[PDB]
Amino acid sequence: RWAPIPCSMLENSLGPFPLFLQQVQSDTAQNYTIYYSIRGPGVDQEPRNLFYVERDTGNLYCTRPVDREQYESFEIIAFATTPDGYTPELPLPLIIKIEDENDNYPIFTEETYTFTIFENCRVGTTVGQVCATDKDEPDTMHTRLKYSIIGQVPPSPTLFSMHPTTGVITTTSSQLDRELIDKYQLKIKVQDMDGQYFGLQTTSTCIINIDDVNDHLP
Amino acid sequence: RWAPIPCSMLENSLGPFPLFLQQVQSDTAQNYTIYYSIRGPGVDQEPRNLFYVERDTGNLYCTRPVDREQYESFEIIAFATTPDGYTPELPLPLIIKIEDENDNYPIFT
């Protein structure tokens, strides 16, 4: 015999549902009365109700959106049955894969990033680093990040710079007196897809303190 | 933008068409022979040839009954020319007013 043909569905699909996957008939409906069903982890085993079939034409659909995040692939049995309660022919195993997009955002590994730096440290001192992670398949474009500063509070002086591939923060300027300005904030962005137009952005603000020495006179 | 003091035609009018509307002319008519024309919606955008003007004397008219439900006014450009083809005076955006008939329904609070 010829074996069956593979199938798939792209993650997080918009709908509306149900969304069609294939037509699975048997030529035996020509020689006596059969109707169509499915079984497996996908209908009657967890996940329940995900797949659905037309009991009159063998059109085979999904009921709701899945996630490449959560799932990978699924094995489902198709079978035919008569109205009088018997199974005169062999079942068809189906194979069905979930497909992946970058659609899960990057996210910073902390609620807010903090940093401390000694008064008037030298230009290009390493202020610290901001880390993010991304739950699409690792070592891919779907997880490839790009790190940017977007702006500074207070907007002046210009004091910091960020390494694009790792979020590594350095200093640019040694005017760092705590006794004039004691904390900065930096409006920061991380994005996937090598930071391309189509990669998905998450923003945060990180803090930099000017860590005290004794230099102001009593 | 605004436009000059208008002239009226009712909606749902019964004619005889052409119904007359106004005469706006150019303030130096004695120097050259003028020919007087019109352009815009109602003449040469849609609906076409709703409007006309006496080409020799600038008396304006319309060709058929109109509705007010989608507009209370109509707008067109009047322009001067000579028999030797040149423009004596600068073109003027005019306005025609469309007055009502009762054909909207009364409706309780």
Partner: protein, 222 residues
């Protein structure tokens, strides 16, 4: 026993994220150790056009490999096959149909580079003057081929003198009076377009229109 369906692929995009599209492979061969090798014949794989599909000689998977053109083929119809090392057809040959689905990817092209026409002096408003014609390569009586015509440039450019009915390609006069004694002719430029036209920025194709003002006996022999 279980049966298969036909497939449908769109014109003009990379289908590299839609594979594999079909497969020819045996279900029990493995339970006799029986080695098979697999081939498809048909337009697109062993007849023209070339480049467009490929198959795996061991596992009989069918894959798209280059851009489809519905102005080249609207359908294809393959037959796939399965032989042992000697010659025996291990499986009965499988029919495979492939519909191509059309998009708008060609813009309409005039029967002339420069059209010629005539209109008389002193004539009434909306005097019909001439018709311009073009052709489209997408599928007839559809919106990918459905032509609209427009004026893009005019000389002398003022006052306004002509309109183009977009739905027929006919050219009509405005309420301004035409005079043979002043404008022997006119020239303007027309653009043919198709479909719904929103946010198009790649250039499209153009022709010239030239209009002769025909004389009347409106002047006397002084």
């Amino acid at each position: 026993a279980w049966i298969t369906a036909p497939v449908a692929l769109r014109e003009g995009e990379d289908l590299s994220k839609k594979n594999p599209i079909a497969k020819i492979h045996s279900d029990l061969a493995e339970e006799r150790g029986l080695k098979i090798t697999y081939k498809y014949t048909g337009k697109g794989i062993t007849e023209p056009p070339f480049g467009i599909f490929v198959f795996n000689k061991d596992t009989g998977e069918l894959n798209v490999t280059s851009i489809l053109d519905r102005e080249e083929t609207p359908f294809f119809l393959l037959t796939g096959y399965a032989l042992d090392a000697r010659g025996n057809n291990v499986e009965k040959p499988l029919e495979l149909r492939i519909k191509v689905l059309d998009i708008n990817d060609n813009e309409p092209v005039f029967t002339q580079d420069v059209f010629v026409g005539s209109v008389e002096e002193l004539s009434a408003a909306h005097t019909l003057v001439m018709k311009i014609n073009a052709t489209d390569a997408d599928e007839p009586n559809t919106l990918n081929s459905k032509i609209s015509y427009r004026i893009v440039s005019l000389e002398p450019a003022y006052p306004p003198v002509f309109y183009l009915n977009k739905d027929t390609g006919e050219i009509y006069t405005t309420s301004v009076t035409l005079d043979r004694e002043e404008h022997s002719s006119y020239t303007l430029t027309v653009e043919a377009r198709d479909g719904n036209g929103e946010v198009t920025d790649k250039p499209v194709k153009q022709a010239q229109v030239q209009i002769r003002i025909l004389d009347v006996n409106d002047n006397i022999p002084v």
